Write a protein that binds this ligand. Structure first.
Ligand SMILES: *[C@@H]1O[C@H](CO)[C@@H](O)[C@H](O)[C@H]1NC(C)=O
Ligand SMILES: *[C@@H]1O[C@H](CO)[C@@H](O)[C@H](O)[C@H]1NC(C)=O
Lengths: 57, 50
């Protein structure tokens, strides 16, 4: 949504561009557009959704 | 100097003009064709227009 996806090598995170501050990747700090076919160099990783555990209450 | 992949530099040029970065990635081959073809017109412009 704002920031860059980054990885240390195995963990995936998102950060603001100008100071390393690794957040977990979520449906809040990201936005969707289209299917995985079109983008060059896209990577497979799980995006977390904070509502899920609350409906699992 | 911080290295960054060129198609990610262009996404952060696009967000600066208010076009959302997914517009670049959904059109990256088209944008590369338009940019490469646009510099072709510079060589023709300078070669023709003394
Ligand atoms: C990056 O470069 C390597 C060769 O060093 C190539 O195999 C790979 O497909 C390239 N990745 C992208 C996203 O173009
Ligand atoms: C990404 O995940 C999908 C679904 O499991 C799979 O078809 C695809 O081959 C994966 N891509 C890579 C680069 O492994």
């Amino acid at each position: 949504r704002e920031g860059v996806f980054v990885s240390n090598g195995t963990h995936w995170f998102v950060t603001q561009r100008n100071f390393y501050e690794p957040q977990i990747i979520t449906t809040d700090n990201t936005f969707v557009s289209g299917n995985c076919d079109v983008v060059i160099g896209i990577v497979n990783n799980t995006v977390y959704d904070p509502l899920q555990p609350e409906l699992d209450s | 100097a911080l290295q960054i992949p060129f198609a990610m530099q262009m996404a952060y040029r696009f967000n600066g003009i208010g076009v959302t970065q997914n517009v670049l990635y959904e059109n990256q081959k088209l944008i590369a064709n338009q940019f490469n073809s646009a510099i072709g017109k510079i060589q023709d412009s300078l070669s023709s227009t003394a």
